[PDB]
């Protein structure tokens, strides 16, 4: 029976004016009674404004509350802190889709409160490894650079590596706008038994591009599938820490209780890492490598591993973290740890971006480790894998031939290289180059790839199986 | 600096202040801070060392009603030839440019071994012109700096890919670089070159290059000065 | 009330301060030095003194004001030089003829002796009035003709008495409102805490370009009115030219210069050209100083004043945004602000994050930068203003590895990066095209479609040409120019022409001090036409060397297109650019046969 | 230990030397396959001389 919540109980809250000190972003309390470690509290400023705070430390009758939105205006004489007695539980419901929430779970679409089906606790327990099952089907994105050559499975966790100024936010918006399931079926994926959903989380997102996400999703109809979690750069830091946890809790609820297929885009993971470093240094911890605390491989793992498909539930969670590489290097702690924890990566290249190619996805470095599980006969089309392989091979050959074009000359190249220059031209500026609102299904992208591959001869399309090649290339 | 301020701002003198081994002063500051168990900045130097160095340096310049001045020429020994060390780095943010003395130029016997590329004067652009010094000063300075930088890059390429593979740009750059470092930068310890003599030497040096490729000099200045041999 | 318990540098611990609040201004010492509470430990409060802390004795009084670090907003704010705490430097020098700033000087920030001509607004007695409402107007300058007097935000009530039209000093009562029994008197000015951003009804999308006048910026990496921008602090680059260009030619209704961490003589710089620079966009030769207030903060001033300089400047910019005026804020070096934050955290014994910088560095730069965007000003009547934050960054070691730039890049939409390869070769404004970016290109498509339809296309074409030629150059520098195709040679030559005659801008020349957007668009058209005709002609067998020698004339025409005087008018310059384009087409048609 | 550039160890210099290493590596490969083409033509010309 569902009626087992037993939430009708009333828990009175103690409010203390016994503030003993203020130290930067945290408030120390002197006479707390049985404090909880991660409890959320409400501060009542002397001017009357109310601020949330999360307990960071609990000594004997002493609790250190780290306060959202700063600590200015707090005096040790008049302010009061109300202890809620529970951690940052969030209200979840099947109709959170179409709602845009703050990074603290408060709706910011001028709508009502969530009207929870359950107050699911944040940062929930880890998925039992014995319950996980391998990803087995493709999640579509509408981007040829990702659909054809870096295909994402239904449980895969694949980041989008990028840098400052590159259009990774617009790529995220496009993916959220055009994602879905691949196979055509007698019933649409908008039903009540084969449904799909998206949870978009923005951390440290700029106000301009936050408004861009809001307007883009509310206007293009993707909102009815999307629960958006905006967090401005000037929003509280603890809010940035909790935002991906809110998004992943919502995704867990939907996928593993409503049995939806949920795609999770965690944009600006580097901003989340900066917030995490700020929180770590707030607790007088000594910074680890590159100033980042040494334990965030664990925290990034907790964020990322809340994904994959499971034994008993038809739902699944697919994550696409998006992180900006600072100074454009993989050796930085954030991309390194994300590569440790996640399957593959998508690369957004500055060189492609400067050429006017959108999306500027560099496919030579980008890899989907478990792409092979998303492609097949009942999974997209039988030619997906070998067409992707052939595209990669001919693109690499084209880049090498472009290197030799200025060293040995155009006429000194081999016939494959002459074909490869123009293949690379057509590839980058027709196939990779896809409009910001151009939604290409996986089959449309596949046959565009075939049209690109039809220029080459039979003999040296050698990385396509001769059965597929003789069934597709020759007409 | 207090005695300099007395004379310049009270006795209306023109004081040239020289503060040798600012690095030793920063070492003393580091020692005091370490004895204080304070929060150490970069390389162990105090976090406030920028403020102290600025309090020292900023005691210069002129004032509205008093006809004196204080001209600071601090000398700091970069501990390991590195300008990125906290002492020179924090000095750069306060001082207007710097005069850089290069170990490499000293090893070649060049005196003074002033390295053009890292050295700077952040208010040279307003002390030169038509009414002060000569009207070619800024253009010839910019051109010499650009040609010296091109010479360094071309020398690196020549070290890597040889002399023959270089263009005429690079070969002219090497020739200009060597005549530069051996005649213009090189100077006697007691040789007082007026700015006009140095400008004439600079023009004689630039006349290595054809007039067409002296692109950092305005065409008026170029036409008026290039042929004045 | 309170008494000092400990002094160690600017940090002062005062006991018997049980009532103090966070970031509350206190009067430290018998001289009444200005300082704010930073930490509270019961009755002991840590105070960072905004002036020189020498001479403080254990036990002298510390009286707490009860108000945070606030800035006075009203008439007289324009044409004025301020420090970080907004102490009027000119008024200080006239009150005390000393060349120095006296310790504990408490001159009012805005002059109390000037009588302003006040024109009452729409509201009358009995009308309910809210925060941000314009209840009157004041003629401040011949350029700021209508300085609108706004009711302070977070203040509302029923109007019970509004002064009639006349001349009023800054302290005279103007408006007397009644809220619920508590009755407040309002004057020409009001104070607003520099830490809290001034509220607005709604933040719009900044969609109109902020014309700097530099061709590389306005062409490849444009900024918008209300955007956020990062510039290198190296002089000769946009650090010194773009500031003057934005103050003298941009469509900003006001300018707020915040020189935090400035050198002593470079401060004396901007205090003499700004009084001697004039505007033409107003229809009369008027000084920029009527549009500008300066926050002068030399490096030898206390570190807390350095930190507060940026906040007081952005609060002034917000105040002028709330009047419906597009105001541009120029921060001389946010890197110096970051170093001030680092020093303060060092004095506080906080754990640093990276290279000593405080962990909240990114949070503080975000809380500063996102006070920029275009907004619908609070209260009635409906109006729209914006704050274009144009903040420069001094790099550390000449690379982007320094934490200040790394934190900045996660906030700013526009980043005009520096290129020491261009700076060392004296190719100004020396903006690194490869790494510089502007996220306002998409937002500006609406502006371009209305005015210059092909502008985004040509900008993308130039970026593509520059990138292709950059990779071609990095190949050539190892291999050489022997084996390149003729098309590769055209790419290299066209990119060299672009870098030398479109991107490069003198800034100190009358013909190119400010390149108008139409002139920039026409120059992009000319250069892209050169590249397109050269590629088309070489595709038809024409040898590139012969074509180059036979079209050196049109190459020189394209090169000298930059020499057109913008003062000749858009019509004349556009006609002459059309003549140049027709001449190029005819010449290439002739030489291709 | 081994040949050294004897350069100022900083993050700026680290990035500079990483870029220099990548450029030198790609130049080595570039000249290697250029030399492969040249030696292929060289062997061809040697056969022409021989017969």
Chains A and B touch (3+ CB pairs under 8 A): no
With CA atoms as reference, the chain A residue closest to D26 would be A403
| Phi, psi angle pair for C29, to nearest 5° | 85, 175
**Token pair in block for residue A124:** 């929930």
User: What angle (nearest 5°) sits at the alpha carbon of residue A110, between those of residues A118 and A238?
Assistant: 60
Half-sphere exposure of C398 (CA within 13 A, CB side): 15
CB contact under 8 A, D37 and A327: no
**Token pair in block for residue B125:** 């652009």
In chain B, the DSSP E strands lie at 14-17, 69-72
CB contact under 8 A, A404 and D34: yes
**Token pair in block for residue C559:** 């090169």
Collapsing DSSP states into helix, strand and coil, what is residue C379? coil
**Any bridge partners for residue B40, and if so which?**
B46
Residue C477 CB neighbour total at 10 angstroms: 16
Residue B200 CB neighbour total at 10 angstroms: 18
Positive or negative, the CA dihedral D38, D39, D40, D43 is positive
CB contact under 8 A, C399 and D27: no
How many residues can be counted in chain A? 475
Q: What is the Cα–Cα distance from A308 to A139, expressed in whole angstroms?
A: 12
Positive or negative, the CA dihedral B134, B135, B138, B140 is negative
CA distance C489 to chain A (A): 10
Query: Taking a C-beta distance cutoff of 8 angstroms, is the pair C499, C491 a contact?
Result: no
Collapsing DSSP states into helix, strand and coil, what is residue A172? helix
Q: Residue B149: in which H helix or E strand, if any? A: helix B137-161
With CA atoms as reference, the chain D residue closest to B80 would be D8
Q: What is the Cα–Cα distance from C327 to C387, expressed in whole angstroms?
A: 5
CB contact under 8 A, D12 and B84: yes
**Token pair in block for residue A380:** 């997209």
Q: What is the Cα–Cα distance from C274 to C290, expressed in whole angstroms?
A: 10
Half-sphere exposure of C370 (CA within 13 A, CB side): 23
User: What angle (nearest 5°) sits at the alpha carbon of residue A292, between those of residues A288 and A293?
Assistant: 55
Q: What is the Cα–Cα distance from C39 to C24, expressed in whole angstroms?
A: 10
CA C126 to chain centre: 41
**Token pair in block for residue B229:** 């041999």
**Token pair in block for residue C357:** 């910088």
Task: Label residues A98-133 b or e (16+ Cβ within 10 Å = b).
Answer: bbbbbbbbeebeeeeebeebeebebbeeebeeeeee
A270 burial (CB, 10 Å; 0-12 / 13-18 / 19+) is buried
For residue C76, give the DSSP letter.
T
Helix axes C552-560, C570-591, angle to 10 degrees: 160
Q: Which residues of D touch C434 (CB under 8 A)?
A: none
CA B75 to chain centre: 13
With CA atoms as reference, the chain B residue closest to C351 would be B39
Q: What is the Cα–Cα distance from C73 to C313, expressed in whole angstroms?
A: 11
CA dihedral angle for residue A188, residue A192, residue A194, residue A196, rounded to 10 degrees = 90
Residue A47 CB neighbour total at 10 angstroms: 10
For residue A137, give the DSSP letter.
S
In this structure, which long-range contacts are made by residues C465-474, counting pairs with CB atoms below 8 Å and at least 24 apart in sequence? C465/C491, C465/C494, C465/C495, C465/C498, C465/C531, C466/A354, C466/C433, C466/C495, C466/C498, C466/C499, C467/A351, C467/A354, C467/A355, C467/C434, C468/A355, C468/C495, C469/C494, C469/C495, C469/C496, C470/C434, C470/C495, C471/A351, C472/A406, C474/D23
Query: Taking a C-beta distance cutoff of 8 angstroms, is the pair C47, C62 a contact?
Result: yes
Comparing CA positions, the residue from C492, C515, C496, C495 lying closest to residue C561 is C515
**Any bridge partners for residue C168, and if so which?**
C116
CB contact under 8 A, A407 and D34: yes
CA distance D51 to chain A (A): 24
CB contact under 8 A, B81 and D12: no
Helical H runs in A61-178?
A: 144-147, 168-178
Q: What is the Cα–Cα distance from B27 to B44, expressed in whole angstroms?
A: 10
**Any bridge partners for residue C227, and if so which?**
none
Q: What is the Cα–Cα distance from B150 to B172, expressed in whole angstroms?
A: 10
Residue C138 CB neighbour total at 10 angstroms: 20
User: What angle (nearest 5°) sits at the alpha carbon of residue B144, between those of residues B140 and B145?
Assistant: 120
Q: Per the annotation, does C237 bind a ligand?
A: yes
Cross-chain CB nearest to A403 (options D15, D30, D37): D30
With CA atoms as reference, the chain A residue closest to C476 would be A406
Q: Are strands C228-232 and C384-393 parallel, antiparallel or unpaired?
A: parallel
Q: Which residues of B touch D10 (CB under 8 A)?
A: 82, 84
**Which residues, in sequence order, are CB contacts of A415 under 8 Å at separation 6+?**
none
C127 burial (CB, 10 Å; 0-12 / 13-18 / 19+) is middle
- In order, the DSSP letters of C408-430 are HHTT-SEE--B-HHHHHTT-SS-
**Token pair in block for residue C76:** 């007289």
- In order, the DSSP letters of A449-473 are HHHHHTTS-STT-TTS-HHHHHHHT
Residue C187 CB neighbour total at 10 angstroms: 17
**Which residues, in sequence order, are CB contacts of A120 under 8 Å at separation 6+?**
A89, A90, A91, A92, A249, A252, A253
Query: Taking a C-beta distance cutoff of 8 angstroms, is the pair C156, C150 a contact?
Result: no
Q: Please indicate if any CB of chain D lies within 8 Å of the CB of A407.
A: yes
Positive or negative, the CA dihedral B126, B131, B133, B134 is positive
The sheet with strand A180-181 has its strands ordered as A152-153, A138-140, A180-181
Q: What is the Cα–Cα distance from A27 to A55, expressed in whole angstroms?
A: 9
CB contact under 8 A, C426 and B165: no
Q: Residue C185: in which H helix or E strand, if any? A: strand C183-186
Task: Label residues B145-175 b or e (16+ Cβ within 10 Å = b).
Answer: bbbbbbbbbbbebbeebeeeebeeebebbbe
Q: What is the Cα–Cα distance from A341 to A232, expressed in whole angstroms?
A: 26
Q: Per the annotation, does C446 bind a ligand?
A: no
Q: What is the Cα–Cα distance from C26 to C11, expressed in whole angstroms?
A: 13
Q: What is the Cα–Cα distance from A181 to B182, expressed in whole angstroms?
A: 73
Collapsing DSSP states into helix, strand and coil, what is residue A55? strand
Tell me which chains share at least 3 CB pairs under 8 Å with chain D. A, B, C
CA distance C460 to chain D (A): 26
With CA atoms as reference, the chain D residue closest to C396 would be D12
**Which residues, in sequence order, are CB contacts of A331 under 8 Å at separation 6+?**
none
Q: Are strands C414-415 and C147-150 parallel, antiparallel or unpaired?
A: unpaired
Comparing CA positions, the residue from C193, C18, C51 lying closest to residue C28 is C51
Tell me which chains share at least 3 CB pairs under 8 Å with chain C. A, B, D
Q: What is the Cα–Cα distance from C118 to C107, expressed in whole angstroms?
A: 24
- In order, the DSSP letters of C544-581 are HHHHHHHTHHHHHHHHHGGGS-GGG-HHHHHHHHHHHH
End-to-end CA distance of chain A: 60
Query: Taking a C-beta distance cutoff of 8 angstroms, is the pair A227, A97 a contact?
Result: yes
Query: Taking a C-beta distance cutoff of 8 angstroms, is the pair A382, A469 a contact?
Result: no
Half-sphere exposure of D4 (CA within 13 A, CB side): 6
Q: Which residue has the tokens 């000099």?
A: B217
Q: What is the Cα–Cα distance from C116 to C112, expressed in whole angstroms?
A: 10
**Any bridge partners for residue A394, and if so which?**
none
CB contact under 8 A, B165 and C480: yes
Collapsing DSSP states into helix, strand and coil, what is residue B217? coil
User: What angle (nearest 5°) sits at the alpha carbon of residue A462, between those of residues A458 and A467?
Assistant: 70
Q: Which residue has the tokens 């049980």?
A: C18
**Token pair in block for residue D29:** 């490969």
Q: What is the Cα–Cα distance from C209 to C444, expressed in whole angstroms?
A: 7
Q: Please indicate if any CB of chain A lies within 8 Å of the CB of C354.
A: yes
Each domain of chain C, given as residue ranges in start order, spans 1-69, 70-113+187-438, 114-186, 439-593
Helix axes A168-178, A207-219, angle to 10 degrees: 20
Residue C321 CB neighbour total at 10 angstroms: 31
Q: What is the Cα–Cα distance from A30 to C409, expressed in whole angstroms?
A: 41
Cross-chain CB nearest to C478 (options D10, D16, D30): D30
Half-sphere exposure of A386 (CA within 13 A, CB side): 17
Query: Taking a C-beta distance cutoff of 8 angstroms, is the pair A374, A442 a contact?
Result: no
Half-sphere exposure of A470 (CA within 13 A, CB side): 3
Comparing CA positions, the residue from C467, C435, C392, C443 lying closest to residue A325 is C435
Q: What is the Cα–Cα distance from D41 to A291, expressed in whole angstroms?
A: 55
Helical H runs in A200-294?
A: 207-219, 237-253, 269-282
Cis upstream peptide for C381 (omega within 30°) = yes
**Which residues, in sequence order, are CB contacts of A225 under 8 Å at separation 6+?**
A97, A196, A197, A198
Helical H runs in A262-368?
A: 269-282, 296-304, 333-341, 350-354
Q: What is the Cα–Cα distance from C371 to C385, expressed in whole angstroms?
A: 12
Region class of C181: left (phi > 0), else alpha (psi between -120 and 50), else beta? left
Query: Taking a C-beta distance cutoff of 8 angstroms, is the pair A166, A353 a contact?
Result: yes
Q: What is the Cα–Cα distance from C559 to C133, expressed in whole angstroms?
A: 53
Query: Taking a C-beta distance cutoff of 8 angstroms, is the pair B10, B16 a contact?
Result: no
CA A298 to chain centre: 17
| Phi, psi angle pair for A45, to nearest 5° | -65, 155
End-to-end CA distance of chain B: 46
Positive or negative, the CA dihedral B143, B149, B155, B157 is negative
**Token pair in block for residue B214:** 């002296």
- In order, the DSSP letters of C356-378 are TEETTHHHHHHHHHTT-S-EEES
How many residues can be counted in chain C? 593
CB contact under 8 A, D37 and A403: no
**Which residues, in sequence order, are CB contacts of C586 under 8 Å at separation 6+?**
none
D39 burial (CB, 10 Å; 0-12 / 13-18 / 19+) is exposed
**Any bridge partners for residue A63, and if so which?**
A29, A58
From the CA atom positions of chain B, what is the Rg in Å? 21
Q: What is the Cα–Cα distance from A38 to A56, expressed in whole angstroms?
A: 6
Chains C–D, number of C-beta pairs less than 8 Å apart: 20
Q: Are strands A160-162 and A316-324 parallel, antiparallel or unpaired?
A: parallel
From the CA atom positions of chain D, what is the Rg in Å? 19
| Phi, psi angle pair for C489, to nearest 5° | -65, -40
Q: What is the Cα–Cα distance from A238 to C387, expressed in whole angstroms?
A: 28
CA dihedral angle for residue A151, residue A157, residue A162, residue A167, rounded to 10 degrees = 70
Q: Per the annotation, does C515 bind a ligand?
A: no
Comparing CA positions, the residue from A157, A159, A153, A150 lying closest to residue A181 is A153
In B31-190, the DSSP E strands lie at 69-72
For residue B40, give the DSSP letter.
B
Query: Taking a C-beta distance cutoff of 8 angstroms, is the pair C554, C487 a contact?
Result: no
**Token pair in block for residue B175:** 């020739």
Q: Per the annotation, does C241 bind a ligand?
A: yes
Q: Residue A53: in which H helix or E strand, if any? A: strand A50-59
In B30-178, the DSSP E strands lie at 69-72
Query: Taking a C-beta distance cutoff of 8 angstroms, is the pair C7, C42 a contact?
Result: no
Query: Taking a C-beta distance cutoff of 8 angstroms, is the pair C23, C13 a contact?
Result: no
Cross-chain CB nearest to D37 (options A327, A400, A408): A408
Q: CA distances (Å), B151 to each of A127, B105, B116, B157, B200, in order?
A: 63, 14, 12, 10, 21
CA distance C489 to chain D (A): 19
**Which residues, in sequence order, are CB contacts of D22 under 8 Å at separation 6+?**
none
């Amino acid at each position: 029976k569902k009626a087992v919540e037993q939430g009708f109980n009333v828990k009175p809250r103690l409010n203390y004016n016994t503030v003993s000190g203020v130290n930067g972003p945290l408030v120390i309390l002197e006479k707390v009674k049985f404090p909880r470690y991660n409890e959320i509290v409400n501060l009542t400023l002397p001017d009357g404004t109310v601020r949330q705070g999360q307990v960071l430390e609990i000594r004997g009758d002493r609790a250190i509350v780290q306060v959202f939105e700063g600590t200015s205006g707090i005096d040790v004489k008049k302010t009061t802190v109300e202890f809620t007695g529970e951690s940052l539980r969030i209200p979840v419901s099947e109709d959170m889709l179409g709602r845009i929430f703050d990074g603290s779970g408060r709706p910011i679409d001028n709508g009502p409160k969530v009207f929870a089906e359950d107050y699911l606790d944040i940062n929930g327990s880890p998925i039992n490894p014995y319950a996980r099952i391998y990803p087995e089907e493709m999640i579509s994105t509408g981007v040829s650079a990702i659909d054809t050559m870096n295909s994402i499975a239904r449980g895969q966790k694949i980041p989008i590596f990028s840098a400052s100024g590159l259009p990774h936010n617009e790529i995220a918006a496009q993916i959220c706008r055009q994602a879905g399931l691949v196979r055509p079926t007698k019933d649409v994926h908008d039903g009540h038994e084969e449904n799909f959903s998206i949870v978009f989380a923005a951390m440290g997102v700029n106000l301009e591009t936050a408004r861009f996400f809001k307007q883009d999703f509310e206007e293009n109809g993707s909102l009815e599938r999307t629960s958006l979690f905006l967090n401005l750069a000037n929003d509280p830091t603890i809010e940035r820490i909790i935002t991906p946890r809110l998004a992943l809790t919502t995704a867990e609820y939907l996928a593993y209780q409503t049995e939806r297929h949920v795609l999770t885009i965690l944009t600006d993971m580097s901003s989340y890492a900066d917030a995490l470093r700020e929180v770590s240094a707030a607790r007088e911890e000594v910074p680890g490598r590159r100033g980042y605390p040494g334990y965030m491989y664990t925290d990034l793992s907790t964020i990322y591993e809340r994904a994959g498909r499971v034994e008993g539930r038809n739902g699944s969670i697919t994550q696409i973290p998006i992180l900006t590489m600072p100074n454009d290097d993989i050796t930085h702690p954030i991309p390194d740890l994300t590569g440790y924890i996640t399957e593959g990566q998508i690369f957004v290249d500055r060189q492609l971006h400067n050429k006017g190619i959108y999306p500027p996805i560099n496919v030579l470095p980008s890899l989907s480790r478990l792409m092979k599980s998303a492609i097949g006969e009942g999974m997209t089309r039988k030619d997906h894998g070998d067409v992707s392989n052939q595209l990669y091979a001919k693109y690499a050959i084209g880049k090498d031939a472009a290197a030799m074009k200025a060293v040995v000359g155009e006429e000194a190249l081999s016939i494959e290289d002459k074909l490869s220059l123009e293949f690379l031209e057509k590839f980058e500026k027709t196939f990779i180059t896809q409009g910001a609102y151009e939604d290409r299904t996986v089959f449309e992208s596949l046959d565009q790839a075939w049209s690109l591959l039809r220029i080459y001869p039979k003999e040296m399309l050698n990385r396509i199986s001769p059965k597929i090649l003789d069934e597709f290339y020759d007409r | 600096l207090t005695t300099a301020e007395y004379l310049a701002y009270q006795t209306e003198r023109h004081v040239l202040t020289i503060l040798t081994d600012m690095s030793s002063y920063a070492d003393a500051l580091r020692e005091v801070s370490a004895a204080r168990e304070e929060v150490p900045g970069r390389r162990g130097y105090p976090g406030y060392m920028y403020t102290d160095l600025s309090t020292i340096y900023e005691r210069a310049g002129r004032v509205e009603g008093r006809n004196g001045s204080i001209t600071q020429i601090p000398i700091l020994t970069m501990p390991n030839d590195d300008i990125t060390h906290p002492i020179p780095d924090l000095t750069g943010y306060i001082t207007e440019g710097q005069i850089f003395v290069d170990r490499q130029l000293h090893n070649k016997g060049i005196y003074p071994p002033i390295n053009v590329l890292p050295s700077l004067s952040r208010l040279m652009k307003s002390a030169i012109g038509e009414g002060m010094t000569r009207k070619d000063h800024g253009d010839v300075s910019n051109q010499l700096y650009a040609k010296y930088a091109i010479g360094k890059d071309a020398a690196a390429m020549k070290a890597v890919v040889g002399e023959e593979a270089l263009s005429i740009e690079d070969k002219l750059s090497l020739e200009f670089l060597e005549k530069f470092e051996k005649t213009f930068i090189t100077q006697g310890a007691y040789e007082d070159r007026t700015v006009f003599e140095s400008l004439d030497q600079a023009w004689s040096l630039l006349r290595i290059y054809p007039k067409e490729m002296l692109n950092r000099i305005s065409p008026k200045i170029l036409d008026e000065f290039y042929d004045r041999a | 009330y309170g008494a000092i318990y400990s002094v160690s540098g600017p940090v002062v611990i005062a006991e018997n301060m049980i009532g103090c609040a966070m970031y509350e201004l206190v009067k430290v010492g018998h001289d009444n030095l200005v300082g704010e509470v930073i930490r509270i430990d019961g009755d002991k409060a840590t105070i960072q003194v905004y002036e020189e802390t020498a001479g403080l004795t254990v036990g002298d009084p510390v009286l707490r004001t009860g108000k945070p670090l606030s800035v006075e907003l009203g008439p007289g704010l324009m044409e004025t030089i301020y420090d970080g705490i907004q102490r009027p430097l000119k008024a200080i020098k006239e009150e005390s003829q000393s060349i120095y700033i006296p310790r504990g000087i408490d001159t009012p920030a805005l002059d109390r002796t000037i009588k302003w001509q006040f024109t009452p607004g729409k509201f009358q007695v009995g009308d309910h009035i809210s925060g941000g409402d314009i209840y009157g107007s004041v003629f401040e300058n011949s350029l700021i003709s209508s300085h609108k007097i706004l009711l302070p935000p977070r203040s509302r009530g029923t109007i019970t008495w509004i002064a009639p039209a006349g001349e009023y000093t800054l302290d005279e009562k103007i408006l007397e409102v009644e809220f619920d029994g508590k009755k407040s008197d309002f004057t020409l000015y009001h104070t607003w805490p520099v830490r809290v951003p001034r509220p607005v009804t709604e933040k719009l999308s900044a969609d109109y370009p902020l014309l700097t006048g530099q061709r590389v910026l306005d062409a490849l990496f444009p900024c918008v009115q209300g955007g956020t921008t990062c510039i290198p602090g190296a002089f000769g680059c946009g650090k010194t030219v773009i500031s003057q260009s934005l103050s003298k030619y941009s469509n900003s209704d006001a300018i707020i210069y915040v020189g935090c961490g400035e050198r002593g003589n470079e401060m004396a710089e901007v205090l003499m050209e700004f009084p001697e620079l004039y505007t033409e966009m107003s229809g009369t030769k008027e000084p920029i100083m009527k549009r500008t207030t300066l926050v002068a903060n030399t490096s030898n001033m206390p570190v807390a004043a350095r930190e507060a300089s940026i906040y007081t400047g952005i609060t002034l910019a917000e105040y002028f945004r709330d009047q419906g005026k597009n105001v541009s804020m120029i921060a001389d070096s946010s890197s110096r602000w970051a170093e001030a934050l680092r020093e303060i955290s060092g004095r506080l014994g906080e754990m640093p994050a990276d290279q000593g910088f405080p962990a909240y560095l990114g949070a503080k730069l975000a809380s500063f930068y996102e006070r920029a965007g275009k907004a619908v000003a609070l209260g009635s009547p409906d109006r729209t203003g914006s704050v274009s934050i144009v903040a420069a960054v001094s790099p550390a070691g000449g690379d982007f590895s320094d934490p200040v730039t790394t934190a900045t890049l996660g906030i700013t939409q526009v980043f005009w990066g520096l290129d020491k390869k261009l700076a060392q070769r004296k190719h100004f404004p020396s903006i690194n095209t490869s790494v510089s970016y502007s996220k306002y290109t998409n937002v500006l498509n609406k502006f371009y479609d209305s005015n210059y339809p092909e502008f985004p296309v040509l900008r993308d074409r130039m970026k593509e040409i520059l990138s292709n030629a950059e990779e071609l150059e990095q190949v050539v520098q190892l291999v050489g120019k022997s084996a390149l195709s003729d098309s590769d040679k055209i790419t290299l030559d066209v990119a060299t022409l672009i870098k030398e005659d479109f991107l490069q801008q003198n800034g100190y020349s009358t013909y190119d001090a400010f390149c108008p957007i139409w002139k920039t668009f026409d120059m992009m058209r000319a250069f892209i036409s050169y590249h397109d005709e050269a590629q088309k002609a070489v595709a038809n067998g024409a040898n590139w060397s012969k074509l180059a020698d036979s079209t050196g004339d049109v190459k020189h025409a394209v090169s000298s297109s930059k020499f057109f005087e913008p003062s000749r008018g858009e019509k004349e310059v556009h006609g002459e650019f059309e003549k140049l384009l027709s001449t190029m087409q005819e010449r290439f048609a002739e030489s291709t046969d | 230990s081994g040949n050294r550039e004897q350069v100022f160890p900083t993050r700026m210099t680290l990035g500079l030397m990483k870029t220099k290493l990548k450029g030198a590596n790609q130049g080595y490969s570039l000249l290697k396959r250029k030399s492969e083409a040249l030696t292929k033509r060289f062997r061809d010309i040697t056969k022409r001389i021989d017969d």
